[PDB]
Amino acid sequence: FRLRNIPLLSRVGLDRADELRSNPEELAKGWAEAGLITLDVRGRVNIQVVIEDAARIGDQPPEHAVFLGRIPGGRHVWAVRADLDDLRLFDDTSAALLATAMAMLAWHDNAGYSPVDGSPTIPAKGGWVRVNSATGQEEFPRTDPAIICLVHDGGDRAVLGRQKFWPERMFSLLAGFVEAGESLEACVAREVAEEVGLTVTDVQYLGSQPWPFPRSIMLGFHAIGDPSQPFAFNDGEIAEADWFTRAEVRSALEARLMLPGSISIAREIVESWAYA
Amino acid sequence: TFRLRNIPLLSRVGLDRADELRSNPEELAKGWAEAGLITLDVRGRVNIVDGQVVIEDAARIGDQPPEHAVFLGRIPGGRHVWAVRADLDEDSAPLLDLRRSGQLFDDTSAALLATAMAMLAWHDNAGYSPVDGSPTIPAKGGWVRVNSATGQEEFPRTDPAIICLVHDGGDRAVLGRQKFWPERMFSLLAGFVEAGESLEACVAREVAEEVGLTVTDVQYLGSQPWPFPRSIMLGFHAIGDPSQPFAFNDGEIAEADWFTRAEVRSALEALMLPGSISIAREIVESWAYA
Ligand SMILES: [Ca+2]
Ligand SMILES: [Ca+2]
Ligand SMILES: [Ca+2]
Ligand SMILES: [Ca+2]
Ligand SMILES: [Ca+2]
Numbered sequence: 001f002r003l004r005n006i007p008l009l010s011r012v013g014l015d016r017a018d019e020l021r022s023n024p025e026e027l028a029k030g031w032a033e034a035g036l037i038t039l040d041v042r043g044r045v046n047i048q049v050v051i052e053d054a055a056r057i058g059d060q061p062p063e064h065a066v067f068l069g070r071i072p073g074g075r076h077v078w079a080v081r082a083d084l085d086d087l088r089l090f091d092d093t094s095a096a097l098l099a100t101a102m103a104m105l106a107w108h109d110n111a112g113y114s115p116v117d118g119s120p121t122i123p124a125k126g127g128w129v130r131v132n133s134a135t136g137q138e139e140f141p142r143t144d145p146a147i148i149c150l151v152h153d154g155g156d157r158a159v160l161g162r163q164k165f166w167p168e169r170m171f172s173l174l175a176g177f178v179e180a181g182e183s184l185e186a187c188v189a190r191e192v193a194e195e196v197g198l199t200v201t202d203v204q205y206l207g208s209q210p211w212p213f214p215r216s217i218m219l220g221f222h223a224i225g226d227p228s229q230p231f232a233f234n235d236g237e238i239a240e241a242d243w244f245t246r247a248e249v250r251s252a253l254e255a256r257l258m259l260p261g262s263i264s265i266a267r268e269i270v271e272s273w274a275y276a
Numbered sequence: 277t278f279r280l281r282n283i284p285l286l287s288r289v290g291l292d293r294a295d296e297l298r299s300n301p302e303e304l305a306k307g308w309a310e311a312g313l314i315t316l317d318v319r320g321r322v323n324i325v326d327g328q329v330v331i332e333d334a335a336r337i338g339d340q341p342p343e344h345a346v347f348l349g350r351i352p353g354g355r356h357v358w359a360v361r362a363d364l365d366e367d368s369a370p371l372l373d374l375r376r377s378g379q380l381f382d383d384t385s386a387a388l389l390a391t392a393m394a395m396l397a398w399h400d401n402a403g404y405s406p407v408d409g410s411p412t413i414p415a416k417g418g419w420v421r422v423n424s425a426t427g428q429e430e431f432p433r434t435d436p437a438i439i440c441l442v443h444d445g446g447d448r449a450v451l452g453r454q455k456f457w458p459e460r461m462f463s464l465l466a467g468f469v470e471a472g473e474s475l476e477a478c479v480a481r482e483v484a485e486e487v488g489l490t491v492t493d494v495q496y497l498g499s500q501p502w503p504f505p506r507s508i509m510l511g512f513h514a515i516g517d518p519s520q521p522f523a524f525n526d527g528e529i530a531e532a533d534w535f536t537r538a539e540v541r542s543a544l545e546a547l548m549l550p551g552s553i554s555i556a557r558e559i560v561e562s563w564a565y566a
Binding site for chain 2: 019103114115139141177180181183217
């Protein structure tokens with residue numbers, strides 16, 4: 001099966017205007033007529049995202065602002081953190097602006113110092129790097145790849161799992177972070193084995209979604225497992241799991257077994273499987 | 277469309293990482309006396325014999341796992357295997373690096389080395405918290421570092437990068453040559469995934485930035501660890517329009533062109549395409565002979 005829909009935060013590619021990032025003159029020129037999106041510390045916004053006049057906060061782009069690119073018509077848009085008076089629905093462009101702003105400002109919050117030598121870092125190039133104050137070495141935004149997998153039997157049954165300390169009825173796909181030295185396919189097999197003890201084959205990619213909570217990209221997969229093999233939960237974070245039929249899943253979707261919100265690529269994978 | 281013919285090098289085998297032992301300091305300390313040890317120099321080179329990484333006796337360097345060692349998992353016999361950085365005697369044996377000689381390694385050795393290389397390089401670059409600047413201390417067999425001030429765990433970093441073969445749906449594909457590259461050296465278009473974008477959006481954005489094409493039907497082919505120093509390469513193909521002209525926007529590409537399957541096959545059997553462990557070569561090969 002393929003995904004029926006593009007995942008929600010994946011929909012558009014905004015015009016990021018990469019070439020402007022290293023052009024402080026063009027950034028400073030665009031500022032007077034530029035738009036500004038403002039996020040609080042949890043990455044929440046005012047709502048379509050409110051775009052205010054950048055010029056209101058100053059006559060030049062502040063250090064801690066991030067240049068998001070251009071909206072249709074060529075207006076520059078920036079993002080800043082501020083005290084205000086959760087993506088966790090928006091138009092496509094707002095969703096992309098927010099995903100970018102959220103990820104980038106969360107990175108800044110967590111990248112104030114060099115991991116290499118501990119020196120403070122200074123934002124630069126429209127907020128797309130931070131520079132080691134001592135050495136001049138550039139640090140770059142971090143996005144951790146994570147897999148999320150629907151294990152199925154090749155027919156009408158699929159594994160869903162509930163993490164320890166998730167609410168009782170809340171089941172979903174199996175997830176994990178990619179480790180150093182492994183392929184995505186190897187990561188999927190490893191993580192499924194760790195979580196529910198199954199050996200899976202035919203690991204197949206479905207799609208992807210930015211997941212700035214705070215810094216993931218979710219990579220969706222399906223894989224073939226064997227229901228005659230028993231579960232085993234000890235090595236993982238799963239409290240329980242079971243094989244469910246397409247009928248059960250469709251039923252749970254139409255609502256009791258609870259599946260994650262359409263925001264997650266997880267829901268899109270399950271939906272696309274259940275109605276294939 | 278098309279699929280990869282081969283699993284990329286470095287993707288072939290998945291190590292027994294024995295994750296549960298990382299958080300069991302007692303079992304790690306017990307296993308040490310009979311444990312194996314792989315040693316990498318600063319450039320990530322090792323000694324190999326018959327395609328297989330040399331495993332020395334861990335006990336020779338000390339009675340306990342040193343702080344800077346990384347626990348790689350289990351080798352045959354129940355034995356633990358670890359990696360450390362060390363100065364290697366460049367004159368008393370050939371030192372092979374994965375990037376130049378990866379083809380010579382057994383699958384398991386290649387994966388051990390890829391993991392060790394990535395993990396030791398991470399340690400070298402993760403001595404301090406990016407959050408607050410505090411020193412960090414390795415723990416869990418080298419699989420985290422702990423903020424000395426706050427106790428917050430820092431985790432190994434792997435940056436996703438895409439690499440894309442843009443084609444016309446038929447018999448022609450874009451290859452591009454970077455400014456810093458020798459004449460006739462062409463390859464696929466590559467870039468790092470940025471915050472806030474999907475892989476598909478990243479592919480479209482990077483192709484646009486590098487050669488000015490608008491591409492659709494972004495399709496995943498495969499993946500390969502790429503510890504030089506800390507990537508994972510994610511291979512894709514996409515449909516471009518040859519009637520749209522190139523534009524070398526971001527300044528990274530000096531030239532690019534559409535090449536036929538015949539040209540590419542020809543260049544592979546020797547536009548220069550050298551031999552390579554990169555997924556890039558596997559993508560081009562798989563396309564050219566589809
Ligand atoms: Ca551009
Ligand atoms: Ca585990
Ligand atoms: Ca051998
Ligand atoms: Ca020496
Ligand atoms: Ca690039």
